[PDB]
Curated annotation (Swiss-Prot):
Residues of the full protein shown: 61 to 92 of 92
Tissue expression from the record: Paneth cells of the small bowel.
Covalent S-S links between cysteines: 4-29, 6-21, 11-28
Homology family: Belongs to the alpha-defensin family.
Known role: Host-defense peptide that has antimicrobial activity. Exhibits activity against Gram-negative E.coli (in vitro). Probably contributes to the antimicrobial barrier function of the small bowel mucosa.
Name this protein carries in UniProt: Defensin alpha 4
Localization in the cell: Secreted; Cytoplasmic vesicle, Secretory vesicle
Length: 32
């Protein structure tokens, strides 16, 4: 279920900001 990953700057699909994985990073969790 929890198919989220830490990205830097942007993501390929699923760009989100639920739980910041850092400062210059973000959280990318797709819906599939």
């Amino acid at each position: 279920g929890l198919l989220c990953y830490c990205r830097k700057g942007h993501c390929k699909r699923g760009e989100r900001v639920r739980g910041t994985c850092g400062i210059r990073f973000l959280y990318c969790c797709p819906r599939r």
